[PDB]
């Protein structure tokens, strides 16, 4: 309804994005550095967790509409009850176990439980739109508020997880000059570690503090959402979604681009630290990226309004290529790194704002191709989001697995040559390859600013 709730419904988008951001950037750095797991098992954890997040979205989406309207609502008790366990199982991801055997299960189980509960919070919250009010204009305004707050929540998650963890940098042991295999298992023997273990406990306490702060924001936003908001076959669908070829072409293109950019997210969070060597201020670089993207999103809105969206995709997503090559070609420089970071932030904002506004156009084109369909309109978003998250999980798993195969050394402060070559390929070779293949498969998308017809007919 009025702003008496459209503001309360807005903050609900923050829990999913902050938790989802601080994870996506920092989790691979956590399991590899402060949790010190074997990169093979860390790859397993990342892959399985993001694949389970992708799987639990349709599961939960079906689990609703089968649950009865209780005294609290139908979609509201999900959010009311999943929040305590969500924040509990989220605190326990950033907590190192109290055991010497079964360390990987402690992270698999709790990352999967948190994915399930954050899904049981976001999917009923997402579906809460259609029950806020009966007027479509109010639902669209609430969706705009929600997306604004979600972008700002990405910003807050980055800022918090970077400034809390940045106060206690991760300690690194330089490569033993008296050793050739660079193994630490031999160097640490006969060597006191109380200082190093103390610094490691300090950074682990910083990660636990950041987890507690993010969980507190989760709890607070969930309480506001629950007190300020009071609400009032499928196989056929999957066979039909493959019969709208224009949607399929848009999906292939935007999926390749978004996959490139999430690969950038994770492996760049690691690459800034280990390859460039800015372990002390990589949080500032991540915050600069995110702030540039968030402040430049409205410019991209104006661009979409000025030119076609098919021109904005090319210009915005292609702006990243030269700077992504520059960052790996030229040596480390905190003045060049900030510039490539702000350019990559602009391009990230472009590549993530464009699909979100081009997909409703293929929805409108499908409403004209098969104009008798009831339902089968959010199945497109479901398919796109599932194949985004599943593929990003597969790619992050393969990235950490390749870092395992390159001889990633834990406790190290300078990684081997193959690890640096991989971290350079996972930011410039593979991402630029994927970006170009996406922008080349986007040439096969029919609506080329012919949306005027889809608009006037509607």
């Amino acid at each position: 309804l009025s702003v008496c709730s459209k503001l309360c419904y807005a903050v609900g988008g923050a829990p999913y994005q902050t938790t989802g951001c601080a994870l996506g950037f920092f989790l691979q750095i956590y399991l590899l550095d402060v949790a010190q797991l074997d990169p093979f098992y860390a790859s397993i954890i990342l892959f399985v967790g993001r694949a389970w997040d992708a799987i639990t979205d349709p599961m939960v989406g079906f689990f609703i509409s089968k649950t009865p309207w209780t005294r609290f609502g139908r979609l509201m008790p999900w959010i009311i009850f999943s929040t305590p366990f969500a924040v509990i199982s989220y605190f326990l991801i950033w907590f190192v176990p109290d055991i010497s055997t079964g360390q990987v299960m402690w992270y698999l189980i709790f990352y999967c439980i948190f994915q399930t509960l954050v899904t049981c919070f976001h999917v009923p919250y997402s579906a809460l739109t259609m029950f806020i009010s009966r007027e479509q204009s109010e639902r669209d305004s609430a969706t705009a508020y929600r997306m604004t707050v979600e972008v700002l929540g990405t910003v807050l998650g980055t800022a918090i997880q970077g400034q809390i963890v940045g106060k206690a940098v991760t300690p690194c042991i330089e490569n033993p000059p008296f050793l050739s295999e660079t193994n630490f298992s031999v160097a640490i023997r006969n060597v006191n570690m109380t200082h190093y273990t103390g610094s490691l406990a300090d950074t682990r306490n910083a990660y636990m503090v950041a987890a507690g702060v993010i969980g507190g924001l989760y709890i607070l936003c969930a309480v506001i959402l629950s007190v300020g908001v009071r609400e009032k076959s499928f196989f056929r669908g999957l066979k039909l979604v493959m019969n709208h070829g224009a949607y399929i072409k848009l999906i292939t293109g935007f999926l390749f681009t978004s996959l490139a950019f999430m690969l950038l997210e994770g492996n760049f969070a690691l690459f800034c630290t280990y390859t460039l060597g800015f372990r002390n201020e990589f949080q500032n670089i991540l915050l600069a990226i995110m702030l540039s993207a968030t402040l430049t999103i409205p410019f991209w809105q104006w661009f979409l309004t000025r030119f076609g969206k098919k021109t904005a995709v090319y210009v915005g997503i292609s702006s990243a290529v030269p700077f992504l090559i520059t960052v790996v070609v030229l040596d480390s420089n905190l003045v060049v790194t900030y510039i490539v970071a702000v350019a990559a932030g602009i391009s990230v904002a472009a590549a993530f704002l464009l699909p979100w506004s081009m997909l409703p156009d293929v929805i409108d084109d499908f409403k004209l191709q098969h104009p008798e369909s009831r339902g089968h309109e959010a199945i497109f978003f479901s398919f796109y989001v599932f194949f985004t998250k599943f593929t990003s999980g597969v790619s992050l798993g393969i990235s950490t697995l390749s870092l395992d195969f390159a001889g990633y050394q834990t406790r190290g402060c300078s990684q081997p040559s193959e690890v640096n070559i991989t971290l350079k390929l996972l930011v410039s070779a593979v991402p630029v390859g994927l970006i170009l293949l996406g922008l080349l498969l986007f040439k096969l998308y029919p609506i080329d600013e012919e949306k005027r017809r889809e608009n006037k007919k509607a």
Partner: antibody
Amino acid sequence: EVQLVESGGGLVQPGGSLRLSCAASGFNIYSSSIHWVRQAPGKGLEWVAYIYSYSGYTSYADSVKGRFTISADTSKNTAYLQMNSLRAEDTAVYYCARSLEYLYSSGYQYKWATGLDYWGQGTLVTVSS
Amino acid sequence: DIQMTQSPSSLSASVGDRVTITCRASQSVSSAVAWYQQKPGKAPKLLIYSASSLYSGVPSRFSGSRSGTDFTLTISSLQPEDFATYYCQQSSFYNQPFTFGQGTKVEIKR
């Protein structure tokens, strides 16, 4: 109890061959490191050489590089310092000393250092005609 | 090579006096110092490594400090068994030659 006993001394001719031995007890050389440090007669201590017996990493002083060669033998648990092409100024008392590798914090990095924790008794060599 | 220089080369102090011995490292940073003590005709003894870390079995009289590349060793109560020669050594693998300092002969004062 840790003990380091040196062997090999006496008079050397200028430009001769002398192998100083450092026998170890109460600890394994193959697991630990060994420094060799000479003290001239009536002068301050002067670090000579260093070896990490597991990998084989040896360092030498700028004055002894190319003349002295440090080594370790695990079959006897003994450090060795071979001295060839000796000038008539290397006459001194040589101590072998177990190292104490530790880590000092330089910001966030933990760099490696070494302290000579237990010193041998030192043996006297006189390089002179 | 790094030139470690002990600024006092002969100190005089009777029992009970606060003794201080400095050792300036030419290189600015990324170095550790190791303070040893040698009696006349006896092997040295590692007193303080890492510039502040007492060795196990060393009395608490000794105290080290890293004051901006100016490493320092202080004895709070000079017991009449501390009249020896104190050396500072460049303990760090990054600055490879672990060259010693000049020495600081402590002798009774009268």
